[model samples]
Target: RTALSPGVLSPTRPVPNWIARPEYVGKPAAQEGSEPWVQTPEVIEKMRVAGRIAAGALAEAGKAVAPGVTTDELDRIAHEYLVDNGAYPSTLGYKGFPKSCCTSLNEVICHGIPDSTVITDGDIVNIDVTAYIGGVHGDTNATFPAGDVADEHRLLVDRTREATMRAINTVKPGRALSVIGRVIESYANRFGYNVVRDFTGHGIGTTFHNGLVVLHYDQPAVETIMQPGMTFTIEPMINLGALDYEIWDDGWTVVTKDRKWTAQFEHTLLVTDTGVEILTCL
Candidate 1:
């Protein structure tokens, strides 16, 4: 294991010759809409397919996480999975992000650029993956505990995921978007943890992050009501220490102020007639 602050920036991982690239790659895509960016049924179906592909990539990379495996290798594995399956790794070169997937380790809140960092036992790491396919983006992540994870952090990982599940159960047609943060923060509060405030869930679909801003904490002004065709991600970052975070020298990675462990789980959700559908699921 190395220090929390990396000494220098790693070079961007070059996209292979065969890997499919998203339309938004190398720079921002032309912005076209304002929220509630309702996806049509045909578009929603495409997102659902992309979501499954992204989930499989994440699962594949996660299966290789172990004490001796480097984070860079995990990134490569995920990148290969997406390319072989005909999906583009949405994160590569997006606003100069260097890696194919994000590997946020231990105290790192999110967007921890995969580098030479190695997974050690008793550590929990969040691997975030978003795949662009069929002209839409599908996003999901989960924090996985290394072999023989410590007891406290093991519980932290489990409840952080449950925090996401409970929040998803709270989703239904006509529910206020504001309530997402309310319920998520409420659940985090119940267990005496902090929701990393720097980052929240996002609206995802046709254009990556070109949708609505889905706050994970209670922000009262979000009056947007849900409709049947909306799609967004519900990824809550729960911390075992201070919610206050510092961005690393790389200008991308985020870590807790107090340097304590954090865990997160995410699912791209689609609103339905009665409830919500989890796009990034089996």
Candidate 2:
């Protein structure tokens, strides 16, 4: 583990090779319209089922993580799991994406293209999964260590998950959407950590990404009053160094500006009259 210097300024590194020329990478392409953003009761029910299917797929793939396990194998597991459960792997062929899930390692931020890369000891990987079932979608992701990782990497993973849970706990009817960002920033900053700014969470139901962009950093005027039947995601991407990030040449993968480790967790949520219901939990 590298020791942190108290007052050192992290350097701005180049974007990942994949994102810089993202002819088909990182571009989230889907039918864009208000229809996809609307959360109907029937659609919400379908999303619930999709959430279960995605969660189950994640659990199954997580158990297969080991030193010699290829990322393609994990992708196959998730793809088969989703199909077997009557759901479609949302990432496959979506906007030219070629995998069932995103497997971002080390400095890779998000939208990582799953390939034949093999998992090795001491490596950190983030698995992002989304599925379409019963005409709706569910999205979630989490970071996991390949084996035993450095203390700094472990800390980044732990805090990222913790911040996600904290944001979820604050969800409810009539709550301000900005509250999620406030809590996320406060927790990460307490550890002197940086939150990724390029990517943000969003509403998800009939479509994978919807209205109401949920930023992870504190903003002065980004507010949306939560209401019943509202559904969205609260994902926090935490960085071990600077918050700034750049896209790779492929135009999909994002990496930290300082080339430090990054971790993230996501969940699809619904605001009820009393509180929020997590659709992606087992």
Candidate 3:
């Protein structure tokens, strides 16, 4: 398999001035250390709204994936959709990320900036979208096949999403945060796939990335208990080969070190009394 490379990135797309932007628009985003992991009822309601907008934007972009389509075009589709709905693209300015959304094709694991790269047949693309509105943020993503994808790659994509859901299913009050990663790791291992540990799901709300850490691999040391009002994302990046990865010089794009393809799926979840709510689902 061939390795993916970065292409010439177009200028950052502009969001309308009237749309609200996160506080990190002009500078690096600060690590959200002081915020509470659990959210208020009012905040959760706002997050539900933002989550739907993000899920809608991701669906619109995912429908446009095909051979001969540029990743930049995908970015444009999402950028416009979010703005039209009066929501801000969360990743556009976060930590100097240039694109409104991430387009990780084939060997890329995550954080693939949307650029001039034209996708071709037999490729898989992962699009991640996050929207900010009502003083809250919602994030979600899914991988797609460009055309005539190999059966092995299709299985990889399908299993990766299933792993995420299984992990999400394990969330509940009194459950340790470690259950998320343990469930995902166990499912991926059954398929002989590897989980990328460098990037884990995170706490997200009014701040893009809050303090809570959601691991995608089993870590017994992470004993934080899940509780009602906790809001976070469960995104797992599963690789078909080695778990190692290399980040591009741009400081954003990440790819599998073995040059093998990877797939990822994500959803922002809210821990509730009964269980978890998939805030990003359509």
Candidate 4:
């Protein structure tokens, strides 16, 4: 029932000298083609370590989601966690992004900057975190309820997560890349929820955003085949109302055009010989 608005932003947290940062830290994201779809054994191992650090940081920040918690505080928690782990907060300064992680609140589909917005009971927030370490990146996120929430809103968050998992489960060698979007879109439609199309998961590795595209809506034209050693993310942003959205002037925040709420979940995945490995899960 409350209207959402932007709040004052806190100063960006600093990383230690010992941490390794991606090349895009203070520059615009590179337009270079993505890393190879099939990652090397050395890269895969480093991604696992990075993914775990990102997931652990997300869990620690999520624990503080409650009434009166500011989004900036949540970012600080995640920032410190990554630095302590000897990893850099991957989103920091990427294309001028000031926050260590994205703290998207109600009505914001994704990329909501970590600001002074205080979360209240009944509110839902999606915390997206990515970490860079040992020359690779790991990305993951999940929506969390601030406190007591209505069943309808809680269900939106819950189902969004299940949708991500369901899509991830479909990953295997030789499967069509289109299967991801098919599974996600169909599942969301069954519940009358619509999927956000503007944002799709991408391959991630040595680069912050590897160029491989992973759509969340069905796209039969995409004939890319899943192969063993392929690494990517399957993040779906599901909206409770219409799929329309708008970006704020900050150039990072994305809110629903109708002001309705949306929820999202993401994970870095590795396509194994017979199945998929969810590298970001704790």
RMSD of each: 2.1, 8.1, 1.0, 1.0
lDDT of each: 0.84, 0.78, 0.92, 0.91
Candidate 3's C-alpha runs over 4 A off are none
Query: How many clashing residue pairs, candidate 4?
Result: 0
Alpha-carbon lDDT of model 4: 0.91
Better structure of 1 and 3 per lDDT? 3
Global lDDT for candidate 2?
A: 0.78
- Scored by lDDT, model 3 comes in at 0.92
Task: Estimate, for each residue in 190-236, the C-alpha lDDT of model 1 and write its tens digit.
Answer: 88998877688878878777658888887889899987888988999
**Candidate 2 to native Cα RMSD, angstroms:** 8.1
lDDT winner among the candidates? 3
Better of 1 and 2 by lDDT: 1
lDDT, residue 220, model 3: 90
Better of 1 and 3 by TM-score: 3
Instruction: Give the runs in model 2 whose Cα sits over 4 Å from its true position.
Output: 1-28, 36-38
Local error of candidate 1 at residue 242 (angstroms): 1.0
